[PDB]
Design a protein around this ligand. Structure first.
Ligand SMILES: Nc1ncnc2c1ncn2[C@@H]1O[C@H](COP(=O)(O)OP(=O)(O)O)[C@@H](O)[C@H]1O
Ligand SMILES: Nc1ncnc2c1ncn2[C@@H]1O[C@H](COP(=O)(O)OP(=O)(O)O)[C@@H](O)[C@H]1O
Ligand SMILES: Nc1ncnc2c1ncn2[C@@H]1O[C@H](COP(=O)(O)OP(=O)(O)O)[C@@H](O)[C@H]1O
Ligand SMILES: Nc1ncnc2c1ncn2[C@@H]1O[C@H](COP(=O)(O)OP(=O)(O)O)[C@@H](O)[C@H]1O
Ligand SMILES: Nc1ncnc2c1ncn2[C@@H]1O[C@H](COP(=O)(O)OP(=O)(O)O)[C@@H](O)[C@H]1O
Ligand SMILES: C[S@](=O)(CC[C@H](N)C(=O)O)=NP(=O)(O)O
Ligand SMILES: C[S@](=O)(CC[C@H](N)C(=O)O)=NP(=O)(O)O
Ligand SMILES: C[S@](=O)(CC[C@H](N)C(=O)O)=NP(=O)(O)O
Ligand SMILES: C[S@](=O)(CC[C@H](N)C(=O)O)=NP(=O)(O)O
Ligand SMILES: C[S@](=O)(CC[C@H](N)C(=O)O)=NP(=O)(O)O
Ligand SMILES: [Cl-]
Ligand SMILES: [Cl-]
Ligand SMILES: [Cl-]
Ligand SMILES: [Cl-]
Ligand SMILES: [Cl-]
Ligand SMILES: [Mn+2]
Ligand SMILES: [Mn+2]
Ligand SMILES: [Mn+2]
Ligand SMILES: [Mn+2]
Ligand SMILES: [Mn+2]
Ligand SMILES: [Mn+2]
Ligand SMILES: [Mn+2]
Ligand SMILES: [Mn+2]
Ligand SMILES: [Mn+2]
Ligand SMILES: [Mn+2]
Ligand SMILES: [Mn+2]
Ligand SMILES: [Mn+2]
Ligand SMILES: [Mn+2]
Ligand SMILES: [Mn+2]
Ligand SMILES: [Mn+2]
Lengths: 355, 356, 356, 356, 356
């Protein structure tokens, strides 16, 4: 019970600091973490030491040659334990010092360093659904369905906003951590929510979202509920869950940048399948259950773009159409995507001209 | 659980500021909201940026041309997240920049801006009933009725004031927000309560009332209950819910302003139907279940006025009668009325002298 | 849930001030209340404005001429909302500015003003029983009885003090309110408790007791329990509940004031029925269930007085007999008496020498 | 659990027989019983032996001289244990062989023998409410009220007929027992029911009703509920419980017997209080909570008769009016009356022509 | 509990017989009943005596002239009490021996007798929904909805057939009663079922349906559920409840009866509104919530005929088309219709050739 825990957490900690290292596991979806005591507060991520873990217990190596490296990547303030304690998102490397199969950050970071003069900015909309520990969505009638979609999107009242406590707590944990949380909203399916992260330049998009995600799970853990990023948690007449990625370069944000937005969309229109394969951890099999062309989605087989069009693969927000500068929104990525794969694909297709 | 939450909400938030944008959806009764992060604290409503939402998810636009505009109208302090965070009432406009069908603030503002030298003040009494999530009123016997009306009005005791925690929390949240809450009371039906908002000049009446209604639903949300503004939530020998609108111009508040009170009433007497059509979101259908001439209502079909008379369409409070100045009370609006429609009707009829 | 509420109640409220107006309804026993926002903290009760309420919803007037006046009488600090908020006990008057039928303060006050040189002080022992919301006393076995009386009077232990949280909370609320709470004790019946208010001079007795009673009902409301002031809430072999009124004048408090105590008691002995009628709201029919001559009561039909005698109509406490000065205790008033009625009878009989 | 019991009750019993002796206790309303084993089946009430009991445990005598007599009066078949076992209604006599204070049958029987040539028949409508173990009517919302009266009289459906199982079981028990049960209906108040016993000649009315009542309390015991015969078990806007006594003599049953019916009513009109005193066990005090003139009752203070009039003290049913023969309905008796008292009074007033 | 009851119901009852009289109340939809003991088993309905009831406790007369007549119309065996016990359906008459406002049988019998030579047969399909005591359909998630319609029509399994015990019990009860039950099926909405009663000549259609309805409510009572005949019990994407009245005359059943089926469908096309007013007890307002044109209904405002067309007002079943004889199906009657009013309209329009 969390009133007991809180008494303990009030105890002055002293000169020692806790650092919780976080990594992506052998599934490409699951996050793992563990804590060490440091002698003093690190002033930045470069002062954090390297560490390691049992790769055989995360599906990433064999028991008899099991140590796998953790190398600090991004440091944040720990909103579960307060200052001076830290969260550290790490990269994983194998016994031979090569990146792990699910270390998609390594290549992504290199790609972003190469296009830094164009200052690529990303804003990702992590939709997700709150679930009871029993597998059924939070607040839903037991063995049953609430009333049809309509009243839950941005809704207020015990009869339609299910789980706001998580959202509020997460929002505040992120602000404390230093994660660039841009906003939040209740979504179309009851118990389904959203937070936006951005705009983040370069590799920091992936960094900030993954830590954002870790904070969601730890937060939910405290409330005794589960966050799912599955793109279609409830089959049938219920909305799925995406991770719309908004994107802009410097040129796109300048006066008449819409020219370049349109060039970018044109390029994406030729590399649809490649992006579908980049946009969920099962190469597109997961989005196959969301991207149906209903429930505010595009069909998985058909590329389209349009102004203010929540049925298109890419939407140009009304604002951006009017102002003729800004960003476009790629609506194809699954809620369970790896932002390093999503953001890397966008750079390769839009800035590096791969085909 | 709420204790877990409070721990997170004790964390210092830093330099960034949260702004919750609030609007009226396609039903004209539901409120919607969402939050953006800003780089610093806005010093007034004019410093808040425009925004937009998916109008196809609120019954206001089509999926494939869905964005709709949010334009800040009224800013308040957020009593759920504390300073420096904000609540922002917005007006909704369509893809073509025109007011949404349920944007009744737009016209109403213009009408208030035109009669501002007469400083119209309004006081609205929002009644509402607290409901369990099972659709049965809060504190009522499961599947059953509490004892007859009599002891609940302005009552005190666990056996008669059902839900005061909400009432107390909402009163304090409003005060902190900057909402001009004038008072509150337990009401005749058990689980039913009231807050008064006013006196508010002009367009601020609708602004304050709508934000007050938002705060109530959010407060109720924390307590795992629902507030309903339905004008007759329980049929039979149980009181309905109204939104009595108290109204005065500068002339009515001066010595012998009763003269002008009587004139406003005389004009209201000829435009009863038009007011009934303006007094709920279904043009009088919701009020048909309440305005019966019983349970301290007037009959929907009959206009009447009277001093201290809780059965008339209009009541002149005893105070006003004695002092020969003040305001009159229009007792016809439904609990679920849109105050912009209500206040605008009163201006058109009483100040702009419209007929038909 | 009360943890949620406390978060809202920690919000700084700002410049505006809440004033909870409190009055006695048409039953002469029920308390009612409602709140208004004021622009600044009032510093005397007189700075509070008159108000009014619907008398048709408290059984005191008709709906079609309904407003009834609230005139502030006594002001206290609000222990539910904190400084700068206020509780205000009021007098009720009719449409014609005459006192309500259940406004017994009006005459009482005038009677105290006639004898102010004699400085009458009162001390009232409010006994009450804590009840579950199901009508069964708090802590009692479900559908049954605890063990017999003996161990509960002034008792300590989870198995004998039922409901101390309420008592401790109310003690502190009154101290903060500025109500002159003299003490408290667990009583003979389990779930039954007592608080003493005094000594209060003149009209303040009734003011303080009524506010104490209001504060008790509000406190119980928080704990999800009911206080009953019924004089015999459980029939049979269980103590009833009275409101022992201790009384003295200047003369009685001075050296050898026992002479005047005894003179007062002789006047009381000739006016027993008149007092009984004044000592509950049903003119003696409620006390007929308590004043049995058992369970530390006198029989309703006989007058008797004695030193240290918990069976007499009047008791002279041992201390007072010994010091030959102080006060006497009238043990006849019902727990649900109206203190304005009790204190006034005492003055008329003992100081104004009335007969009738 | 009744399945366990039912297996034991399938065991064939053997040659021995069980007789449960039943009597009225010191309260005049409470029924007592105990069982003895007999060598063989009695073929009538006269082959049953006298017995006794502890009067000091039924409020009827002193511990130290306590045995009181039981003399068989009416024998019936036992529907709880089946043939060949028996229920026996007894008269109670004191140590000195005189009738007990609550043995009203002894005087009744004589009065019936004084007029047996006119063959008095009676039918009584025992109304009663089923209550939970918790003191609250069966099927009612916990701590609350079902919907208003209207749908429950002769109702069918889970949401309006509460406790038919009891009614059905009892009906069948009485028939088996040999009680002259005439019919049943659900009543106006939810969980309130009725059975009619009749028509019974003379003393057998009281005999049959008391045994009917015993069978009812027994049946209820199996189902874990209580029957109350209180005349007003829920105060306010709910029907109370009566025991309408329908009455006729041979003259009244013959052609143009209405002549004599109206004579009978004229005599009763002059002895109203006398009958109210005979019509509940507290000589009228219980009926003062029921006979209000509302809820299909007469006013306790007023005598009246009318054809088909459920507000009158006496009702001549339409059937009887049309045919000009039959009987009349005394609607004054309480649900908790002693039928020996009611039946005795009617004979004294109507047939023996007493005045006083 | 029901195990206790069944023990009692195994007691052999002896020579007396229970007759439960059943009637339609002031609502036109409510069934009432009550029971009397008879000296022997009646063999024909004509043997059963007239009776009466309190019309003032059923909304059919005033307290002070309240008796209303019951005249036995149709007799059946009682499946709740078994042979030799009877269910009797009655007609209600007023104090002045005229038909009660809701006795629609009286006129219908005269119409039926006019066309006895055309031997009119009806078959009615009583659709109904099983509800919990709590107002929510049986088996539905609590506060929630089950999965979309599709798998429930004629479904099998704990996840799609909700309440078969009721259906099976009712089927068997009707067959024992003597009610002409033609079949049953689970329906499209979960918890919604169907039973067919037919084919019944003339006035015996209404008689059989109404008793069937009684038997259903009674059976549901046993199980602690409610049956509703509301035509649209759950709003939205859920089927409503009809009472499809199939119909033929002797000409229509003979070879090439389709000729006369079509002539009758033609006469019905010109009296749509008349029939809509005849087809629910609120003159069409209830059917307004069901006859939308969706959920296998026709639009209330539109007449249509069609072979195998479940969207049509009238459906000619494939069978009847292929064989050019039989009957046609009026799909317009609400689940809560009075069969006497439905079947009367059909004879009037089709056989008596009425207009306007
Ligand atoms: N110039 C930009 N480049 C990339 N992302 C941007 C830019 N400007 C805003 N964003 C981001 O786009 C996201 C907008 O998402 P959201 O507000 O959820 O819009 P919608 O629901 O209309 O898709 C936010 O993360 C925001 O920070
Ligand atoms: N001059 C005025 N003009 C308009 N409204 C006023 C004026 N004076 C007071 N009011 C408002 O009228 C309302 C009175 O409502 P309430 O106190 O509930 O009255 P009631 O006696 O009708 O229940 C309050 O909102 C109050 O602020
Ligand atoms: N001079 C006085 N006049 C009136 N009341 C007094 C005086 N002195 C003390 N009292 C009051 O009498 C009451 C004593 O109550 P309590 O201690 O319960 O007495 P007991 O149980 O001994 O009757 C207290 O309110 C106390 O303040
Ligand atoms: N001639 C009669 N003399 C006495 N009682 C009769 C006579 N005829 C019928 N009764 C009885 O009167 C009672 C009728 O009560 P009930 O059927 O409940 O009528 P209601 O409710 O209309 O007053 C039954 O007990 C019946 O046996
Ligand atoms: N010639 C007829 N006249 C009247 N009713 C008939 C005739 N033949 C069959 N029926 C009845 O019509 C009804 C058919 O209903 P049902 O089997 O539910 O039809 P549906 O195909 O509409 O589901 C049954 O009551 C059946 O007995
Ligand atoms: C309301 S929605 O259009 C819903 C998107 C849907 N869940 C999906 O992308 O699958 N997203 P948004 O308005 O945040 O851009
Ligand atoms: C107590 S009441 O008369 C009740 C009004 C009722 N609820 C209605 O207007 O329907 N309102 P108020 O006294 O606040 O003016
Ligand atoms: C313990 S008692 O004697 C009990 C008094 C009793 N309840 C009555 O006055 O009815 N009163 P006190 O408070 O004076 O000690
Ligand atoms: C329906 S009632 O009028 C109810 C009478 C009420 N319970 C009474 O107290 O008398 N009795 P009845 O129909 O048996 O004559
Ligand atoms: C399955 S249904 O078409 C459904 C009928 C719908 N409930 C109605 O309102 O008629 N009736 P039928 O048993 O004739 O097939
Ligand atoms: Cl850890
Ligand atoms: Cl939000
Ligand atoms: Cl208040
Ligand atoms: Cl026994
Ligand atoms: Cl019955
Ligand atoms: Mn979004
Ligand atoms: Mn979204
Ligand atoms: Mn988006
Ligand atoms: Mn008010
Ligand atoms: Mn009000
Ligand atoms: Mn008002
Ligand atoms: Mn004391
Ligand atoms: Mn005491
Ligand atoms: Mn005392
Ligand atoms: Mn009866
Ligand atoms: Mn009756
Ligand atoms: Mn009767
Ligand atoms: Mn069918
Ligand atoms: Mn069907
Ligand atoms: Mn059909």
């Amino acid at each position: 019970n969390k009133g007991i825990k809180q008494v303990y957490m009030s105890l002055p900690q002293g000169e020692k600091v806790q650092a919780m290292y976080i990594w992506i596991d052998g599934t490409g979806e699951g996050l793992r973490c563990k804590t060490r005591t440091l002698d003093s507060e690190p002033k930045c991520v470069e002062e954090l030491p390297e560490w390691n873990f049992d790769g055989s217990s995360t599906l990433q190596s064999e028991g008899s040659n099991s140590d796998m490296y953790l190398v600090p990547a991004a440091m944040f303030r720990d909103p579960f334990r307060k200052d001076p304690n830290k969260l550290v998102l790490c990269e994983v490397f194998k016994y031979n010092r090569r990146p792990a199969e699910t270390n998609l950050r390594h290549t992504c970071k290199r790609i972003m360093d190469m296009v830094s003069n164009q200052h690529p900015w990303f804003g990702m909309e992590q939709e997700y659904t709150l679930m009871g520990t029993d597998g059924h969505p939070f607040g839903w009638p037991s063995n049953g369905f609430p009333g049809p979609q309509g009243p839950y999107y941005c809704g207020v009242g015990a009869d339609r906003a299910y789980g706001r406590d998580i959202v509020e707590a997460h929002y505040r944990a992120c602000l404390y951590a230093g994660v660039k949380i841009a906003g939040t909203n209740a979504e179309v399916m009851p118990a389904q929510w959203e937070f936006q992260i951005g705009p983040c330049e370069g590799i920091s998009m992936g960094d900030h979202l993954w830590v954002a995600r870790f904070i969601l799970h730890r937060v939910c853990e405290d409330f005794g509920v589960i966050a799912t990023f599955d793109p279609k948690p409830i089959p049938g007449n219920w909305n799925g869950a995406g991770c719309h990625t908004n994107f802009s370069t410097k040129a796109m944000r300048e006066e008449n940048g819409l020219k370049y937005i349109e060039e970018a969309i044109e390029k994406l229109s030729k590399r649809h399948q490649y992006h579908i394969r980049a946009y969920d951890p099962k190469g597109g099999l997961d989005n196959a259950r969301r991207l149906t062309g209903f429930h505010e989605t595009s069909n998985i087989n058909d590329f389209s773009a349009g102004v203010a069009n929540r049925s298109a693969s890419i939407r140009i927000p009304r604002t951006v159409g009017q102002e003729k500068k800004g960003y476009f929104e790629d609506r194809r990525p699954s809620a369970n995507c790896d932002p390093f794969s999503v953001t890397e694909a966008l750079i390769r297709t839009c800035l590096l001209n791969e085909t």
